[PDB]
Design a protein around this ligand. Structure first.
Ligand SMILES: *CC[C@H]1/C(=C/c2[nH]c(/C=C3N=C(/C=C4\NC(=O)C(CC)=C4C)C(C)=C\3CCC(=O)O)c(CCC(=O)O)c2C)NC(=O)[C@@H]1C
Ligand SMILES: *CC[C@H]1/C(=C/c2[nH]c(/C=C3N=C(/C=C4\NC(=O)C(CC)=C4C)C(C)=C\3CCC(=O)O)c(CCC(=O)O)c2C)NC(=O)[C@@H]1C
Ligand SMILES: *CC[C@H]1/C(=C/c2[nH]c(/C=C3N=C(/C=C4\NC(=O)C(CC)=C4C)C(C)=C\3CCC(=O)O)c(CCC(=O)O)c2C)NC(=O)[C@@H]1C
Ligand SMILES: *[C@H](C)[C@H]1/C(=C/c2[nH]c(/C=C3N=C(/C=C4\NC(=O)C(CC)=C4C)C(C)=C\3CCC(=O)O)c(CCC(=O)O)c2C)NC(=O)[C@@H]1C
Ligand SMILES: C=CC1=C(C)[C@@H](Cc2[nH]c(/C=C3N=C(/C=C4\NC(=O)[C@H](C)[C@H]4CC)C(C)=C\3CCC(=O)O)c(CCC(=O)O)c2C)NC1=O
Ligand SMILES: C=CC1=C(C)[C@@H](Cc2[nH]c(/C=C3N=C(/C=C4\NC(=O)[C@H](C)[C@H]4CC)C(C)=C\3CCC(=O)O)c(CCC(=O)O)c2C)NC1=O
Ligand SMILES: CCC1=C(C)/C(=C/C2=NC(=C\c3[nH]c(/C=C4\NC(=O)[C@H](C)[C@H]4CC)c(C)c3CCC(=O)O)/C(CCC(=O)O)=C2C)NC1=O
Ligand SMILES: CCC1=C(C)/C(=C/C2=NC(=C\c3[nH]c(/C=C4\NC(=O)[C@H](C)[C@H]4CC)c(C)c3CCC(=O)O)/C(CCC(=O)O)=C2C)NC1=O
Ligand SMILES: CCC1=C(C)/C(=C/C2=NC(=C\c3[nH]c(/C=C4\NC(=O)[C@H](C)[C@H]4CC)c(C)c3CCC(=O)O)/C(CCC(=O)O)=C2C)NC1=O
Ligand SMILES: CCC1=C(C)/C(=C/C2=NC(=C\c3[nH]c(/C=C4\NC(=O)[C@H](C)[C@H]4CC)c(C)c3CCC(=O)O)/C(CCC(=O)O)=C2C)NC1=O
Lengths: 227, 172, 162, 147, 161, 61, 160, 160, 172
């Protein structure tokens, strides 16, 4: 009954291994409910779930889920049922689902939930019909039953961005909250009449004759300060 | 998602004032046509699967190269996908007819839809005529007067027409 | 925003179903109570400058320290009293936005979400705004079900702050 | 450049003054002398006057010295008034017809200023800052130059 | 100043012979494209200011000829440009209708590169403005009409070089 | 000319039935709104300037 | 019109009218039956062409109608649509005259001086005429929409 | 400057300079000490004269910065203030030259062709210079504010 | 992520020689200043929520259009997001002060912060105004001689000032 469009993979960091036994400093901190946390250390998991599935913004008083928080602390539901309550939360609909289309919302729910980037643009095409046929509640449980969710998160780990940085290096890739914001350039530009009409304030006035031209040694002073 | 009432409010809060006095009278104009707004949608969802299969057969009375071997809508996965996309487009224009403006139509369905089909290889204008085979199967179905009494309601079916050709130019 | 229309649309693409007659009645009951709603939003907009300056004075009569304490959070300046009067302008404008669309959608989007984080960062006491809203709730002069609709969105603004 | 002579378009559109009056006042304007008088020499100003207020090049050498001495003594206001008040202006244009450029296929031309007049009826005319006609009419009499 | 018909008549007249099959063969070729050239010259007349506004913003709007010291700094100098670019888009329209670029060198090209060197106008930025102006002109009139209007733009760019 | 007075001599009269109901949207009760993307751009809210008229509009008589 | 300036062209040149001028006066008068039909369509569609014309104008330029805009209030908005009724009328003249000569000396010559002296944004009124053009060309076939739209965009060009 | 056009005036008239012309070149050069002080005030106040200049410009013309305005976004608003830095610079030239001759052939001649060809509302940039004028004259005494403001309003006049 | 010592180790790791005995004297001068470093950080992390709200309040008086109706930081949803956005910049500036090098400032904070203000439409020049508001509050609190011995600490407050105007030029 209409299987998914057979897309193709690509080259990424999460589908190879690291050879990192005893990983040093850039570990992304496995908060889990098999380490048996105290009641002040359940609270450091619930903040990490809110920071992963929302951004750091929407951890407001109105966007908290105080009945879903209590059922985690009674060990009634798991972490996998707690992430599913956060995408089906009514703050996640009106802030992150009404302001972008179905092909950008798949880029949110694979970067935050699976912790990997999208493979190519056909995977956003291949996944966006699941939201329009059986709904968002039918979209999350077919995304939380994938083998990429179970083989490194399972039923007890709040997800994270897997292999963001290369171990000898210090730059790496971009964090996913700074990769895909709440809305993009294509939703912002079409609404410039009703919403998003701001016009911009004045910049600091730089005079025009102080700007560097080709063959000026002031275009290399940022190179010299990195020496 | 905004209905017809929220589009007035979101333009006035961006400016920052309250609603005018003619300001609701035009919204109070909308609610005395409220039964006439609703029972149009009581036609177009209650005969909704008839509108799909009549238009999808009559598209290949016009362009039978889609069902040709090598064509786009040839195979049984792809014939099940062509009836899928015409069921979704008919679903969102029924949502806009109960709203009053097209804001749920071009935020869910039509936004970024041309660039899907060009990356898929689906012919762009050849699905737009499938939408126009559903409009005349529905705006003639809206003018039918089974069960309801008689009054002039040509203004509302122009908006029901007005969603089907707003959606038609967004896939070409 | 959550109107009764946009939540009837929202349960349809929850399941991904068509709009049945379990949502046409939700829009039908909205059209019944919109004739006692837009007669309330008209009267609150017409007496808006009487209600706003009367509600700023009800705060200053109950809390006289705010008119004379030095510091930025209090209305003892010229610009402190202007920022107080536009705040009660903002609380009345979201009531008449909520009466028009028939639900708590605009004040969820614009007032309520994020309110605690700015009343704590700018030292604004939430008992000031309950006194500004309690003056409106029994001195708009409305009478009947037109009064019963204004006393459900003023009371929704109070229970956020309370 | 958004220039404007509203007073002159006034007094010509009503007919209060002729086109010849409107042309002479344009010549004594300051937007003119900033354009075709200041950047040039009195030698080159005389030839550029003929292209504008007469639609033709200088004809002889004595026609130069008569009109150079006038510009030499009265400047722009004395030169343009001495062209607009000539007979040759009136025979071609009196009070109503804007001056045209008397091209090759207009009029029986003369063999003596053939090359120069074709040079003068070009947009490249205002950049020959060296006088083209006073040297050419004078080398017609003197011997071959050193070059 | 000859069109395609004037050039055909001249070459057939300059040998003193009548209009044979080869001379009329090109004339029939010009009359076939007569319908295309008018519609090409139609839309260019309508969008004259829009085309020049698109070319300068796409080629030389923000380059340092636009800034102080550049060749286009002062408002008189900037205003001379769009006045100057108007002739290229206008005279190219005449060549597109006449079907012969004789009007360009007769009234535009002669003394042009010798004039810009006098003023110090950069010929390099000028041609790229006309190239960008040629690019937008192919947008309006279509492909083949853009091929026709474009055939006289680079004629200006070639001789102006 | 007296038979054509006061109706057909007023060219702005024919659109007063529509430009009077096109302009009845988003009324502002206190002083301050029509913020328009975050600038001041306020109001006058009198009887005259709610109809947009000026000092050159009653002095025209 | 094409008749009056084809005359004053050949008038200035001291000559009569060429075949190029007289085969077009001829070609224009046989076109006259089709021109009156086109102008007849815009004549009694001014209620929709103007009112829907100001429809898109305010949705695209809410500043001019917002408080502080030039066309603010019940008063200016009526005059805000009055000018569109003017320019829609001149386009009916240009269609019947076969040229923008009626539109030239009415509503175009010195138009920037008027609107600059009235405080009106001249770019805003240009946006209004463009909104009327889409409504006008939507009322006619493709062969006609290449004309009725053709006179609007000339008015757009001269109005900026 | 007053020196160069008092010359080219008497240059065209085939004469030398009168006492009326030479008692003012004389009167201007003794004024030169006071002119450099006035231009020195505006020279290192461009941070406050431009930034507060664009302050009132956006509060008075939110259309130009709103979405759809010509100076919309981070980009155009920077150039939106760049032109004010230009015109504030030319006023410093006019004060030292004792005339709008520097402002004439820079930023004034053919200015309407540029801004019309850039899509910028020329009336909007005129509003910007007026906002700079109130900031500039607020930085100087009454005897100076009759000069520094005096060159702005000439730029206001030629810019419309 | 590096500290100040890690950038001297990993530099000569690429060259592949042992760390020279004149480079140890530069690392031992750092640990002599290691306890004057720890109360620049303790001065700014303790008045952290009053550096933020006194700098936002100074911003919203200079540019009042950011908080007026129809402005960017207008509502109570978005005042809280603007107030968060300076807390994150003050967090990572103090992180790069305690490490000695800016390798965690431009990695988890500034890595594409400019390109998400073009997508959100936030004025990036105004965020760089409100960072220099916070720079002026934080170097005045690092000169506070209460509960600390008197000495010359001018070279370390000039390093704290370096991480403030690095994060300001990375958003414009
Ligand atoms: C003799 C080999 C040359 C060389 C190799 C080299 N490669 C890398 C790093 C990566 N290679 C990949 C590629 C894939 N990973 C996969 O999982 C798959 C299957 C889909 C492919 C095709 C990736 C993702 C990396 C980066 C992550 C990783 O470390 O595995 C490196 C590491 C670079 C480093 O400094 O860490 C090396 C050294 N380089 C040479 O110099 C040789 C010429
Ligand atoms: C009469 C009320 C009392 C009072 C008010 C006062 N408020 C402020 C400052 C702010 N108030 C808000 C609140 C909102 N902004 C919104 O957009 C909305 C939703 C529409 C709400 C509820 C915010 C964000 C501020 C700070 C920014 C600002 O507007 O200036 C102030 C100024 C305090 C300061 O530190 O700036 C005052 C004085 N204070 C009183 O004394 C009255 C009792
Ligand atoms: C006074 C501040 C100016 C302003 C701020 C503003 N910012 C946002 C939204 C975001 N900022 C970020 C940037 C980061 N988020 C991070 O989590 C990190 C560290 C990893 C960085 C560097 C992101 C992702 C957003 C989107 C949501 C969020 O996470 O905060 C917003 C809200 C946007 C909205 O419309 O809801 C505001 C208002 N805006 C101004 O007006 C000031 C100039
Ligand atoms: C049928 C009459 C026409 C046609 C249809 C066709 N469509 C697809 C594939 C897709 N269609 C979409 C469209 C949407 N997805 C949504 O979620 C929404 C609402 C927001 C829309 C409008 C998408 C994402 C796909 C790809 C995924 C899928 O397989 O469904 C196909 C199949 C392409 C394939 O290779 O599988 C077909 C055949 N094509 C025609 O020829 C007709 C004109
Ligand atoms: C569940 C959804 C639902 C509905 C559709 C309406 C159904 C409905 N419609 C009408 C009443 C009406 N319904 C219509 C509508 C129409 N008449 C026609 O001839 C057209 C075919 C069609 C519009 C396109 C009109 C015109 C009236 C008013 C009768 C009249 O004009 O006298 C009434 C009588 C009371 C009333 O006006 O509301 C009812 C119950 N109510 C509902 O609860
Ligand atoms: C974990 C908590 C923790 C701290 C808070 C610091 C606190 C601290 N600072 C100093 C020691 C010092 N602290 C300062 C600091 C300052 N003097 C000034 O004038 C400035 C205002 C200010 C910092 C900007 C100086 C200058 C010294 C050294 C005294 C000197 O060499 O003159 C010492 C004594 C160390 C010693 O005796 O060797 C301690 C405990 N260290 C810590 O481990
Ligand atoms: C310097 C002294 C001086 C003056 C005053 C002057 C006036 C003058 N006013 C004119 C026209 C005009 N003047 C007006 C003026 C008016 N219409 C009204 O209703 C008002 C009462 C009045 C404005 C106050 C109009 C409308 C025309 C155009 C007439 C036409 O086209 O027939 C004309 C015809 C030519 C032209 O404008 O180009 C001249 C010459 N000329 C001068 O040299
Ligand atoms: C019909 C054929 C024809 C052409 C083409 C022509 C050009 C011509 N261009 C000129 C100037 C100019 N042309 C420019 C043009 C430019 N600056 C740039 O940076 C660009 C590269 C370029 C625009 C594309 C400028 C700035 C001036 C003014 C120069 C000055 O004031 O010194 C001038 C000097 C006089 C004047 O403009 O009034 C002439 C005569 N004349 C003709 O008869
Ligand atoms: C046939 C050619 C022609 C035109 C075009 C014309 C225009 C014209 N527009 C006017 C006013 C006006 N025009 C506007 C127009 C607008 N406000 C906006 O926001 C929009 C951008 C724009 C309309 C689309 C406004 C607001 C006034 C009144 C201004 C005032 O009262 O100060 C007036 C003064 C009042 C009057 O007599 O009508 C004239 C004469 N006259 C003509 O003969
Ligand atoms: C010294 C005399 C002088 C001036 C004045 C001048 C202006 C000038 N303004 C420009 C752009 C611009 N100017 C504006 C201006 C504005 N937007 C608004 O809303 C306001 C009304 C207005 C400013 C107050 C904008 C938005 C652009 C960019 C337009 C675009 O990108 O299409 C450009 C093109 C880019 C550049 O090279 O800078 C020039 C040359 N050049 C000069 O030599």
């Amino acid at each position: 009954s209409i299987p998914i469009l057979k897309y193709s993979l690509s080259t990424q960091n999460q589908r190879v291994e690291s050879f990192e036994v005893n990983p040093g400093d850039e570990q992304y901190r496995i908060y889990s409910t098999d380490s048996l946390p105290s009641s002040s250390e359940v609270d450091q998991i619930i903040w990490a779930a809110y920071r992963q599935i929302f951004s750091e913004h929407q951890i407001l008083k109105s966007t908290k889920q105080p009945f879903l928080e209590s059922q985690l602390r009674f060990n009634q539901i798991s972490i996998k049922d707690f992430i599913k309550g956060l995408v089906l939360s009514a703050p996640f609909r009106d802030l992150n689902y009404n302001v972008n289309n179905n092909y950008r919302f798949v880029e949110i729910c694979v970067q935050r939930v699976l912790g990997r980037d999208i493979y190519n643009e056909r995977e956003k095409i291949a996944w966006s019909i699941i939201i329009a046929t059986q709904g968002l509640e039918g979209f999350i449980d077919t995304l939380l039953n994938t083998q990429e969710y179970l083989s490194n998160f399972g039923d007890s780990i709040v997800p994270f961005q897997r292999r963001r940085i290369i171990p000898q290096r210090s730059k790496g890739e971009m964090p996913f909250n700074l990769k895909t914001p709440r809305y993009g350039i294509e939703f912002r530009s079409k609404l410039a009449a009703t919403q998003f009409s701001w016009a911009s304030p004045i910049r600091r006035f730089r005079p025009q004759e102080q700007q560097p031209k080709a063959g000026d040694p002031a275009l290399f002073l940022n190179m010299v300060q990195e020496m | 998602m905004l209905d017809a009432f929220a589009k007035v409010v979101a333009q006035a809060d961006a400016r920052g004032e309250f609603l005018s006095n003619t300001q609701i009278d035009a919204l109070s104009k909308m609610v005395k046509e409220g039964n006439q707004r609703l029972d149009i949608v009581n036609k177009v969802t209650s005969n909704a699967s008839a509108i799909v299969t009549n238009s999808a057969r009559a598209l290949f009375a016009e362009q039978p190269q889609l069902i040709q071997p090598g064509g786009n809508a040839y195979t049984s996965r792809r014939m099940a996908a062509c009836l899928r996309d015409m069921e979704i487009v008919l679903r969102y224009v029924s949502y806009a007819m109960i709203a009053g403006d097209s804001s749920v139509l071009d935020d869910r369905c039509l936004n970024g839809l041309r660039e899907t089909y060009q990356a898929l290889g689906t012919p762009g204008s050849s699905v737009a005529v499938a939408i126009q085979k559903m409009k005349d199967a529905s705006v003639a179905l809206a003018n039918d007067t089974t069960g309801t009494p008689i009054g002039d309601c040509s203004s509302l079916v122009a908006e029901l027409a007005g969603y089907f050709d707003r959606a038609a130019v967004s896939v070409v | 925003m959550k109107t009764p229309i946009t939540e009837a649309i929202a349960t349809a693409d929850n399941q991904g179903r068509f709009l049945s007659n379990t949502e046409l009645q939700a829009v039908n009951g909205r059209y019944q109570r919109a004739t006692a709603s837009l007669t309330a939003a008209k009267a609150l907009t017409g007496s808006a400058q009487r209600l706003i300056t009367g509600a700023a004075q009800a705060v200053y009569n109950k809390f006289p320290y705010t008119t004379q304490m030095p510091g930025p959070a209090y209305a003892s300046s010229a610009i402190g009293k202007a920022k107080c009067a536009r705040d009660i302008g903002y609380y009345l404008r979201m009531v008449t936005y909520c009466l028009v669309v028939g639900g708590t959608g605009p004040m969820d989007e614009y007032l309520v979400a994020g309110l605690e984080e700015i009343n704590r960062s700018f030292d604004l006491s939430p008992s000031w705004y309950i006194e500004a809203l309690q003056y409106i709730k029994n001195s708009h002069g409305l009478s009947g079900q037109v009064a019963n609709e204004a006393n459900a969105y003023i009371d929704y603004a109070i229970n956020t702050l309370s | 450049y958004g220039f404007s002579f509203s007073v002159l378009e006034s007094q010509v559109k009503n007919g209060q003054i002729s086109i010849k009056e409107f042309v002479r006042s344009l010549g004594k304007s300051s937007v003119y002398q900033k354009q075709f008088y200041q950047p040039y020499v009195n030698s080159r100003v005389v030839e550029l006057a003929f292209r504008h207020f007469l639609g033709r090049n200088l004809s002889s050498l004595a026609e130069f010295q008569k009109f150079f001495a006038i510009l030499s003594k009265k400047g722009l206001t004395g030169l343009v008034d001495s062209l607009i008040n000539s007979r040759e202006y009136s025979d071609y244009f009196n009070e109503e017809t804007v001056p045209y450029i008397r091209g090759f296929g207009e009029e029986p031309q003369e063999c003596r200023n053939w090359g120069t007049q074709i040079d003068l009826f070009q947009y490249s005319a205002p950049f020959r800052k060296v006088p083209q006609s006073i040297t050419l009419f004078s080398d017609y009499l003197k011997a071959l130059p050193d070059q | 100043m000859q069109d395609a018909i004037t050039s055909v008549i001249n070459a057939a007249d300059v040998q003193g012979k009548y209009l044979d099959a080869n001379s009329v063969e090109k004339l029939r070729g010009y009359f076939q494209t007569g319908e295309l050239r008018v519609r090409a010259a139609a839309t260019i007349a309508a969008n004259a200011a829009t085309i020049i506004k698109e070319a300068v913003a796409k080629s030389l709007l923000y380059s340092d000829i636009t800034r102080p010291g550049g060749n286009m700094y002062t408002t008189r100098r900037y205003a001379a440009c769009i006045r100057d670019l108007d002739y290229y888009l206008r005279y190219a329209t005449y060549g597109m209708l006449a079907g012969d670029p004789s009007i360009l060198d007769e009234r535009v090209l002669n003394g042009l590169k010798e004039t810009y060197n006098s003023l110090g106008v950069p010929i390099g930025a000028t041609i790229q403005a006309i190239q960008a102006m040629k690019e937008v002109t192919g947008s309006l009139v279509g492909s083949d009409a853009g091929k026709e209007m474009g055939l006289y733009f680079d004629y200006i760019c070639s001789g102006l070089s | 000319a007296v038979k054509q007075s006061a109706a057909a001599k007023d060219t702005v009269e024919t659109w007063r039935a529509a430009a009077k109901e096109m302009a009845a949207m988003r009324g502002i009760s206190p002083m301050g709104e029509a913020y328009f993307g975050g600038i001041a751009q306020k109001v006058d809210n009198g009887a005259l300037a709610q109809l947009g008229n000026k000092a050159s509009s009653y002095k025209k008589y | 019109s094409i008749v009056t300036k084809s005359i004053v062209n050949a008038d200035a040149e001291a000559r009569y009218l060429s075949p190029g001028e007289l085969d077009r006066i001829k070609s224009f008068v046989l076109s006259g039956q089709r021109r009156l039909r086109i102008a007849q369509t815009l004549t009694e569609n001014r209620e929709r062409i103007v009112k829907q014309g100001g429809q898109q104008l305010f949705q695209r330029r809410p500043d001019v109608v917002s408080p502080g805009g030039n066309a603010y209030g019940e008063e200016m908005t009526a005059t805000c649509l009055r000018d569109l009724d003017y320019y829609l009328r001149l386009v009916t003249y240009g269609i019947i005259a076969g040229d923008v000569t009626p539109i030239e000396e009415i509503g175009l010559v010195g138009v920037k001086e008027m609107y600059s002296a009235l405080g009106t944004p001249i770019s805003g009124v240009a946006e209004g005429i463009r909104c009327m053009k889409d409504v006008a060309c939507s009322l006619l076939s493709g062969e006609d929409a290449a004309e009725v739209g053709f006179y609007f965009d000339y008015t757009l060009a001269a109005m900026q």
